[PDB]
Amino acid sequence: DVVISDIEAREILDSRGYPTLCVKVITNTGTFGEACVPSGAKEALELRDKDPKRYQGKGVLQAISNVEKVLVPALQGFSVFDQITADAIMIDADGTPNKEKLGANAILGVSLALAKAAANTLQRPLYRYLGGSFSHVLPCPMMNLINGGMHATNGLQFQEFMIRPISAPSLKEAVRMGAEVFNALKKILQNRQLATGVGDEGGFAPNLASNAEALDLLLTAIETAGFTPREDISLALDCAASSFYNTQDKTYDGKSYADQVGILAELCEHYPIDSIEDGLAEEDFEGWKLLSETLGDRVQLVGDDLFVTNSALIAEGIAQGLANAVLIKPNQIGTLTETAEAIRLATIQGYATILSHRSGETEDTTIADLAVAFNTGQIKTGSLSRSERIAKYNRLMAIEEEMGPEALFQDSNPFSK
Amino acid sequence: DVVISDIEAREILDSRGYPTLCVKVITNTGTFGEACVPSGASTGIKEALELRDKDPKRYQGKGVLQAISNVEKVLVPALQGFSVFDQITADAIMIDADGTPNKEKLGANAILGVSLALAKAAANTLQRPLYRYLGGSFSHVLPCPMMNLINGGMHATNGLQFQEFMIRPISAPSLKEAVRMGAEVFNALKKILQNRQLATGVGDEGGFAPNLASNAEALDLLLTAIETAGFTPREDISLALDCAASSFYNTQDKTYDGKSYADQVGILAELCEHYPIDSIEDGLAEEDFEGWKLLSETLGDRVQLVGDDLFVTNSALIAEGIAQGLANAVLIKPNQIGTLTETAEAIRLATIQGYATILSHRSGETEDTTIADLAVAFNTGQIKTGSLSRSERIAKYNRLMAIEEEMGPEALFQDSNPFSK
Ligand SMILES: [Mg+2]
Ligand SMILES: [Mg+2]
């Protein structure tokens, strides 16, 4: 039997230039797996050094030390294949709900590198090791193209405007459709002398005046690339509505939650939007109730800040009838075991799940494997530039090819266009 | 003995959203290596030529399914049965199979993909680090990076004539400290731009293209960024330029935006007196040989002078430049020549003539990190692989840091700029 023998960790930079860690788990046979940990811009504790003379306080040398001095003794000798056991051991070694003692980034690095070490030991694909023999669904992506809100200096209230290449027969064709719309948009922006520098996700933040102008521009880009909105490519939003919710007044840039729901409803009547993420604030439970009752029969309603990949919040959301899809960000919770339990709890209640990148990503592509492992049918992993995004699409295309006739590209949005 | 058994290739996207290929070389023992290829040139007489499909229905003609087909249908038969370790033999076989000087029949992208993937398969067979397989036991020098921060010319829509403004963290005791220095200056620069209401979206290389009016504004802004991050210009961090002067050279008038080659040299000399610039790339146009000699006579004893478009990683051009005394450092882009064997020979031939060599990224990169291993494999002492955001850039720095850590006491961070201090 193959057991954990050592764990190495080192400090790298993420795609924004800030430190994070990569972790290598090594078995007693000399097999190993390596994974790196992303980071967002309210969740499991990302442990930073706070040394002001180093990376403005964002080093992760202490988390690395926790991997090497705490998790190594806690895990060595245990089977490389007992994923749930290893994750429980780390959760207990930390002892706190939010992983604030050892660092959720230290624990997630080990959690992912361990699964890969086991898969590499069996010489089996990670998605098959994690998801079993019937892992076979390639996800329909939601692809960022235009940014606003807190992610821009334009007049867009909402944070992200995405396309979904819903008519693609394959993931690789979904990628091409996305890339061609991206190229048409880039050229449209150049022709309009609007900014073409890209943001964290690899899409654009031109100076547009309103959510509707952004939606119109994506429609123009779709058609210019030669595709039909609604039939070939639909739209999705991330409002990140907490960003413009006044908790004292209970208003969204002056509007009641009922007004805000009316605004989203009108957009959905006039645009081929089939998914809305965080349309109301994370704690506006009456708003979410009205949003779910008003559009939950017609459009995918995704909780991101509402759920934070957290099984307790998901269960409370489902009991109250809120939303119909869950964003899954493994580092928000900190182990694969808890990520899987979030996915299972949502899926058996009829919710879709969507594997998601973070704004600070790395060259690690685990979330592509996780999306296939759990047959989620959806992923959210960025625009069509910058290799910390593209590498996930490249990994999905490799998975689809490796699976040959077993692959199925299949959107899990219940309400597709 | 371990021989080449199969080669696979597949179509991926580069960091710009355009197609390229990854290649997997598989041995008869089942060991393998994988390598991906960055963006090149499809046309012209300067570089070895990458092969594009040119199908308007697919990725705007930029697919690479023909190159993938050449790997599987042409290179597999030419190479199977040969030893995985005979790197030179394999590269010679591929050069022959294509039959053209610029590799335009099979594609430089197909041939380089196999060339890199084969080296990786061999190193993985031996379970040895790639830089140790390619460069031997005394590969151990970590390169001083030149780190993009501000873009201009054809790579921007601002008032900067020059194309790239870079920093070099020359006082770093290690590559990982060089990375931290760069990242802290990058971050201070980003915050300065935010406070000045200037754009912070990034270009291909992961740096900024703010609306600045002149080269001097950009150079001054880098000085402020360095100091704001807590470092001292000249002593901790120097500056480097890529003028890309061919882009503003009028070939009929023989003028650089109205200036003779002598005037442009005078401009560069004034810049070097007033700023801590220790490296200039393509300061004059690629064929202005009188301009380049004068540049070499005026500054070639004081600052590094890089030929990129002057040399295009081509040994016959490098040899003729050295004979005429032009430049003192050479940019090395492996896909501009198309095999590892020719890359190593370009480096060797430049190096024994006293020229420094600088491994370089391309504007369309991938998550592949081979040029990091190559800079260390050949102990070049310098690399040019982008700004401090976007992981097709960062992954190279991350790989350099992994190499340095892996080497322990064997590692040496050492700048090869002849005008190092
Ligand atoms: Mg979100
Ligand atoms: Mg250049």
From Swiss-Prot, chain A:
Region forming the signal peptide: none
A Pfam family this chain is assigned to: Enolase_N
Protein name (Swiss-Prot/TrEMBL): Enolase
GO CC terms in record: cell surface; extracellular region; phosphopyruvate hydratase complex
GO function term, MF aspect, one: phosphopyruvate hydratase activity
Metal-binding found in the keyword field: yes
Known EC number: 4.2.1.11
UniProt-annotated binding residues for Mg(2+): 238, 277, 304
Family membership noted in the UniProt record: Belongs to the enolase family.
GO BP, one annotated term: glycolytic process
Pathway membership: Carbohydrate degradation; glycolysis; pyruvate from D-glyceraldehyde 3-phosphate: step 4/5
Active site: 201 (proton donor), 329 (proton acceptor)
Co-factor(s): Mg(2+)
PANTHER family: ENOLASE
Record SUPFAM superfamilies: Enolase C-terminal domain-like, Enolase N-terminal domain-like
Swiss-Prot record, chain B:
Residues annotated as catalytic: 205, 333
Subcellular location: Cytoplasm; Secreted; Cell surface
GO terms classed as biological process: glycolytic process
Names of required cofactors: Mg(2+)
Gene Ontology cellular-component terms listed: cell surface; extracellular region; phosphopyruvate hydratase complex
Binding site for Mg(2+): 242, 281, 308
Keywords: Cytoplasm, Glycolysis, Lyase, Magnesium, Metal-binding, Secreted
Catalytic reaction(s) noted: (2R)-2-phosphoglycerate = phosphoenolpyruvate + H2O
InterPro entries in the cross-refs: Enolase (IPR000941), Enolase-like_C_sf (IPR036849), Enolase-like_N (IPR029017), Enolase_C (IPR020810), Enolase_CS (IPR020809), Enolase_N (IPR020811)
Entry function: Catalyzes the reversible conversion of 2-phosphoglycerate (2-PG) into phosphoenolpyruvate (PEP). It is essential for the degradation of carbohydrates via glycolysis.
Protein family according to the UniProt entry: Belongs to the enolase family.
Name under which the protein is recorded: Enolase
Organism: Chlamydia trachomatis serovar D (strain ATCC VR-885 / DSM 19411 / UW-3/Cx)
Source taxonomy: Bacteria, Pseudomonadati, Chlamydiota, Chlamydiia, Chlamydiales
